[PDB]
């Protein structure tokens, strides 16, 4: 029947916005508001628990958005990992398609993230525990035929006890560029294709940045950023260069000193030995050679804290057979309706 909204929500102002919450969700908490949505803690009156709610914003605005709210609930729902973020419930308000606007996502509830706690030196074994739960995480989402690609200390998602979750996973898309300082190179300047390991890159720069406190690679523009990573990386040789698409790519390597590759116990001085041929096997501009997450949670690095039952994999691929399809925007607010009368924790 028509309704303004389903039964038992109430409405809400958090943070100077309007939210629409079941009666089960209470004491909302303006947390954060970010490109997509906003985010609120609540308490779950049924179990006494504090979750994370997301409200996504006009998610129906465009098909770049309503295709990116689909595939979102569709990887959060598929995704089943301690170190990955996941869904513990999603609802709307709405009562029928006609005031079908917006949804909410609800997830576990965690207090900060790795950009939030980074810029010192972290002891060794809080590196050890927070790598190990990003590679599980990975090792996990790969497995289902799923990359991050944006990897970085802000979408670690991280609690008091250190416990890690991946956040935002699998949604990756002027004279002007973002930082892009935890990007692979290969990516960057799109010189050969990626492969999963394009993620482990991106760890190798988060453990680096923990292990001294400074971020490893910057730079203004492409070129700049590529020129810092080869001061870590050296200019690579034959066997590399043979492998790049980028034939002018190619040729701007083969014609720069041919500076080697630092010791990396001398480019981290305090890293102890497993610590610095970890970060050697991910810093890696060979994406054929780079470890993969399997291969990294074998590492002595993580011998304190490794756990071969807890590194999972998903059992069946991500399959989203609409991926590459081009529909309106009512089309994808019509799959994602369904998917949210679908759900079931």
């Known amino acids: 029947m028509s309704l303004i909204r389903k039964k038992g929500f109430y409405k809400q102002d958090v943070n100077k916005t309007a939210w629409e919450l079941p009666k089960t969700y209470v004491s909302p908490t303006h947390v954060g508001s970010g490109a997509y949505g906003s985010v609120c803690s609540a308490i779950d009156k049924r179990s006494g628990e504090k979750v994370a709610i997301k409200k996504l914003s006009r998610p129906f ?118 930082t892009r300082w935890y990007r692979a190179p290969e990516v960057i300047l799109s010189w050969m294709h990626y492969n999963q390991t394009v993620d482990i890159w991106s760890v190798g720069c988060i453990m680096a940045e923990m292990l001294t406190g400074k971020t490893l690679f910057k730079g203004k523009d492409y070129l700049d950023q590529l020129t810092q990573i080869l001061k870590v990386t050296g200019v690579p040789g034959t066997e590399f260069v043979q492998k790049l698409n980028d034939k002018a790519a190619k040729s701007y390597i083969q014609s720069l000193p041919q500076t080697p590759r630092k010791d990396f116990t001398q480019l981290f001085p305090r890293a102890s030995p497993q610590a610095a041929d970890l970060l050697e096997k991910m810093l890696e501009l060979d994406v054929d050679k780079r470890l993969t997450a399997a291969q990294a949670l074998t590492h002595p690095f993580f011998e304190p804290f490794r756990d071969p039952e807890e590194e999972t994999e998903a059992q069946q691929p991500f399959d989203d057979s609409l991926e590459h399809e081009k529909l309106t925007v009512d089309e994808w607010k019509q799959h994602i309706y369904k998917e949210i009368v679908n759900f079931s924790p």
């Open 61 to 178: 605005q465009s098909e770049i958005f309503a295709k990116r709210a689909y595939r979102e609930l569709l990887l959060l729902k598929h995704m089943q990992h301690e170190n990955v973020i996941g869904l513990l419930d999603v609802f709307t308000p709405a009562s029928s398609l006609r005031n079908f606007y917006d949804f909410y996502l609800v997830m576990p509830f965690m207090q900060t993230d790795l950009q939030k706690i980074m810029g010192m030196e972290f002891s060794e074994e809080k590196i050890q525990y927070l790598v190990y739960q990003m590679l599980k995480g990975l090792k996990y989402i790969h497995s289902a035929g799923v990359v991050h690609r944006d990897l970085k200390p802000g979408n670690l998602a991280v609690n008091e006890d250190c416990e890690l979750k991946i956040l935002d996973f699998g949604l990756a898309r002027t004279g002007y560029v973002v």
